[PDB]
Structure 1
Amino acid sequence: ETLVRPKPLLLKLLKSVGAQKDTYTMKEVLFYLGQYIMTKRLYDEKQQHIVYCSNDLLGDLFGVPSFSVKEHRKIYTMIYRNLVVVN
């Protein structure tokens, strides 16, 4: 089970949904990303796999104004660049 420590911007995102520990599993990071999208209601109301993130923290993490949760490699790439693997 791979343990990770998020870099500062991702750690800020996690804190905004109450995740405040230093080390996470990958499952946890993606779980909290989902909670962030849900609780901020960032998804398109009709095409709910589309996530809008312009002018949000998440937009600075992805560097683009929207993404689909179907885009697993794009999500992988964002998460990987924003953490350090510790085991």
Structure 2
Amino acid sequence: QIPASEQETLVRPKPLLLKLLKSVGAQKDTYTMKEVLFYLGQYIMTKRLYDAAQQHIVYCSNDLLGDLFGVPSFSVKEHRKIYTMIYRNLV
């Protein structure tokens, strides 16, 4: 859904997103978008923001992730919409 060139572009998270990434072991100030998604995925799995019965929805209410994305839940199927929510959180 997302072109490879766009996934491989270097970006600079704002500090709140950076906090999130660091919490699951990220160590740098800049990442490709593909790396940002890897660490966000790790964060969702670590904090169990998944739902066993309807796995395609992430539940992020009362979590830093929901404050950054501006939503209490989102569909994992919507890659462009997820990219947009992440771009809001970059310098």
- State TM-score, norm by structure 2: 0.85
Structure 2: tracts of 5 or more residues without a match: 1-7
Of the candidates 17, 23, 29, which is equivalent to residue 22 of structure 1?
29
CA deviations 1:1-50 (Å, max 9, x no partner) are 41111001110110111112111111100000111111111111111111
Deviation at 1:73, TM superposition (A): 2.3
SS in 2 for 1:6: coil
| Unmatched segments (≥5 aa) in structure 1 | none
Query: Larger relative CO (CA 8 A, sep 6+): 1 or 2?
Result: 1
**Deviating 4+ runs (over 4 angstroms):** none
Aligned residues: 83
TM-score of the two chains, using structure 1 as the length reference:
0.89
Q: Distance in 2 between matches of 1:51 and 1:18?
A: 21
State, as a whole percentage, how many aligned pairs show the same letter. 98
The one-character-per-residue Cα deviations of 1:34-72 (angstroms, maximum 9, x if unpaired) are 111111111111111110000001110111110011121
